[PDB]
Design a protein around this ligand. Structure first.
Ligand SMILES: O=C(O)c1cccc(O)c1
Length: 308
């Protein structure tokens, strides 16, 4: 079978490379019986559209933001608790935990997809066209976000003016003043060159940004038993590989952003004042897995079970 695999990420992005690597290995491991055609850069639609077509089976596979999935399955919102992870290495350990993996079990019924495992992109950061010396400076700023509720809620609690916008429009929106600031990770700040019209780069690491490898449940049900196992295991391997890329490259891409002639500062949880508390109140009755995920995160840190 010729499977199609969609992503919203541009071609240089880690996810896109991982999807191509997965496709190559599936072709080889299947002895040519199967192939994967990868469609990056939103070629097949936006992420919401792609999830709709995974649900029907019109689209076979995706490497998808857990952000979009959370629009369908609000418990996925638990991963976005601010400062749940202290850094990318902590985040990877959380996403590999039994607690996280258990949350995948609901996807076939609730979203019509099989989630094989979690990967990630980098941590979230903030880039602004003006000076930012405290959280008050974010008040009223038109601030680009990924279109999902956890991040909307964080910025609403801070009093910014969050504005959902897909990746391709962001550089132009900054250049032309349609937004004053953006929420984005260091990989894409580098790749999309969004620092060019920014004043200040804030390395806040305020939220993680998981990825999930998805197979349409309708398509999965049509696979042989051997292929269900082989394809899901192979996809899980490639999705998991992204965690190791970010564990290595996050600080490298971050250091690159000290070389673009802008004001560069690192901030921690205290910078955000009461927004973190407000976020917890909003999400307490929306994401029941949150207390267990917090316990898992805390135990991983206490037992030093990742590189730190
Ligand atoms: O900021 C985003 O919307 C985004 C979406 C996908 C991957 C990624 O690194 C970032």
């Amino acid at each position: 079978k010729e499977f199609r695999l969609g992503l919203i990420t541009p071609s240089p992005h880690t996810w896109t490379k991982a999807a191509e690597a997965f496709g190559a290995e599936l072709s080889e491991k299947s002895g040519g019986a199967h192939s994967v055609s990868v469609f990056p850069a939103r070629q097949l639609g936006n992420e919401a559209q792609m999830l709709q077509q995974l649900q029907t089976g019109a689209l076979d596979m995706a490497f998808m933001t857990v952000a979009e999935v959370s629009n369908r399955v609000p418990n996925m919102g638990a991963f976005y608790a601010p400062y749940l992870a202290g850094d990318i290495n902590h985040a990877a350990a959380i996403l590999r935990s039994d607690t996280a993996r258990g949350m995948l079990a609901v996807l076939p019924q609730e979203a019509g997809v099989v989630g094989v495992g979690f990967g990630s992109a980098g941590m979230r950061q903030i880039l602004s066209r003006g000076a930012v010396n405290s959280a008050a400076d974010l008040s009223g700023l038109k601030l680009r976000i990924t279109p999902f509720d956890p991040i909307l809620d964080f910025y609403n609690a801070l009093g910014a003016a969050p504005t959902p916008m897909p990746l391709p429009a962001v550089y132009d929106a900054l250049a032309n003043g349609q937004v004053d600031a953006i929420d984005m990770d260091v990989e894409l700040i580098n790749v999309l060159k969004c620092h060019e019209h920014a004043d200040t780069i804030l390395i806040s690491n305020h939220m993680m940004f998981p990825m999930v490898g998805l197979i349409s449940a309708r398509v999965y049900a049509g696979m042989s038993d051997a292929d269900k196992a082989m394809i899901s295991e192979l996809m899980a391997k490639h999705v998991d590989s992204t965690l190791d890329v970010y564990m290595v490259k996050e600080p490298e891409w971050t250091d690159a952003l000290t070389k673009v002639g802008k004001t560069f500062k690192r901030v921690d949880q205290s910078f955000f004042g009461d927004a973190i508390a407000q976020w917890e109140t909003i999400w307490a009755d929306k994401a029941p897995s949150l207390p267990e995920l917090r316990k898992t995160a805390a135990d991983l840190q206490a037992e030093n079970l990742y590189f730190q």
